[PDB]
Amino acid sequence: MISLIAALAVDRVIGMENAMPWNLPADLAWFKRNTLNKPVIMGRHTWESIGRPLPGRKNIILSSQPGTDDRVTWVKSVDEAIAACGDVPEIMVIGGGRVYEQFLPKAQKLYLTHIDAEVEGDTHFPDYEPDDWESVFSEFHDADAQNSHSYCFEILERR
């Protein structure tokens, strides 16, 4: 009902310098499939990192300050972000670190890509209690010519 989606390297690293230290087209395709036609909520830094709207999704940006682009919807608290989604089945929270930790307790579902990459970064996915979560889907993929690490797509349900 609220879901988080994220891609985690070793030690739960999710970013460095406001970009993601890997480039895996197969994972971005997974992200697009699981977010298409659903509202996405992101923090202002992630909005900057992405650099443009995500098409085919209502884009909701969290910021304390006035917004700077009317192609997306701007909100000033977690409460307001959820409301702005409108009355839907599934809201997708798309990060970054600070936003994930605030939505985690409200979330029923995690879509996590576990990437076998050793990255030196400055942003992490939450240190979540694993006992809270049932793994209901896993798909491991070897690296290939397009994807320069192995990666595993998991979906976790809150127990």
Ligand X SMILES: NC(=O)c1ccc[n+]([C@@H]2O[C@H](COP(=O)([O-])OP(=O)(O)OC[C@H]3O[C@@H](n4cnc5c(N)ncnc54)[C@H](OP(=O)(O)O)[C@H]3O)[C@@H](O)[C@H]2O)c1
Ligand Y SMILES: Nc1nc(=O)c2nc(CNc3ccc(C(=O)N[C@@H](CCC(=O)O)C(=O)O)cc3)cnc2[nH]1
Which residues contact ligand X (rule: CB under 6 A)? Answer: 6-7, 14-15, 18-20, 42-46, 49, 62-65, 76-78, 94-99, 102, 123
**Binding to ligand Y in span 79-138, by CB under 6 A:** 94-95, 113
40 vs 133, which CB is nearer to ligand X? 40
* Mode of pairing for the β-strands spanning 151-158 and 109-115: antiparallel
31 is an interface residue for ligand Y by CB under 6 A: yes
Chain breaks in the chain following residues, C–N > 2.5 Å: none
Residue 77 binding target from ligand Y, ligand X, none, CB below 5 to 8 Å by type: ligand X
Q: How far is the CB of 125 from ligand X (least distance, A)?
A: 7
